[PDB]
């Protein structure tokens, strides 16, 4: 079944920018109450216990219209948050380079440019939701989904993703939401996001 | 213009359910950029100036296609907020009495059969919401709305409401919303309750 990835660094690995605190609920509690749910939804279904979560979501016209909620939003749950840990590294920051650089040079015209353009996707989901860079057929793009839904129900690739529901910001920042889109470019980790962009391409 | 509507006691009367330092800021902060935001909104628009919020939210469709979504979102705050402060009280707690009372044991069966299932639909609602308690056409009924949704968008007037934004909740309760709903109730206006239901059957 589905499983709690460990983190690949210390809690406090990302102060000043995210607190250690927020880290800790944000995994322990929030991302492992998703995977429970996911777990517990799938029991009675042998039929999809050995599917992978991309299957899952972009199938959901066909799993049973009993569990196709709790799928929606436990399984973007989980597949939001997983993508977003490895996104993050103390040793983050700085801009991209080689291909990705390329890419988003092309797309967005600068660096400075697509930052703006993810930074204002960000600030102007209403509510609870994600704000992404994905792949679509080959193409960049900037969209925004609520709740947890995740790209992949469109068929979009997420290489990038910014979790703008409050939990993930409140303790620290309360309702600044722009200073904490502003603190999160300091430990992006492009060199994840270029290996996912290298690969999403195919 | 619309503004920011004065609290009947300090921030710090509905301890220790709810926190001073929530209070504060959900009020000076959030409550007050919706108020804000719907007077910018508004601004140049001198036609619809006068007309209250009620008359804002039943009629969206007639507004400007480029307003809109600013005032469903930032008329509904300003809506939702208003009444959140009203039923909450530090005299607060206990059971309705009277009309109230009757009503709720006559459609719920028991007041602790309305608490159970009106939890349920504020722990149900998933991302950010309300939970309400509403008269539509006479009768009482529980819902929930996505984000700042208001049920007057939907004719239904509500008499009383929770708030599940994670702000809502998060300094105190961080992730257990079931924790906050349960403390809610210790606070409830019933009085208030009973003379919003008294004028919704008008
Ligand atoms: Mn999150
Ligand atoms: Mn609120």
Do not use: C
């Not at 429970?36 to 972009?58: C, F, V």
């Not at 436990?74 to 920051?93: C, R």
């Not at 989904?145 to 910001?169: C, F, R």
């Amino acid at each position: 079944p589905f499983e709690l990835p460990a983190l690949p660094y210390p809690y406090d690995a990302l102060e000043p920018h995210i607190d250690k605190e927020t880290m800790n609920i944000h995994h322990t509690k929030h991302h492992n109450t998703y995977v429970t749910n996911l777990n517990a939804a799938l029991e009675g279904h042998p039929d999809l216990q050995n599917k992978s979560l991309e299957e899952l979501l972009s199938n959901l016209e066909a799993l049973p219209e009993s569990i196709r909620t709790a799928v929606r939003n436990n399984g973007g749950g989980h597949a939001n948050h997983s993508l977003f840990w490895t996104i993050l590294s103390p040793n983050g920051g700085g801009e991209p380079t080689g291909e990705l650089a390329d890419a988003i040079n092309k797309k967005f015209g600068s660096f400075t440019a697509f930052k703006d353009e993810f930074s204002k996707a960000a600030a102007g989901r209403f509510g609870s939701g994600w704000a992404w860079l994905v792949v679509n057929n080959g193409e960049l793009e900037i969209t925004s989904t609520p709740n947890q839904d995740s790209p992949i129900m469109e068929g979009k690739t997420p290489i990038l993703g910014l979790d703008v529901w409050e939990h993930a910001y409140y303790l620290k920042y309360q309702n600044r939401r722009p200073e904490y889109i502003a603190a999160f470019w300091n430990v992006v980790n492009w060199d994840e996001v270029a290996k996912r962009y290298s690969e999403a391409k195919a």
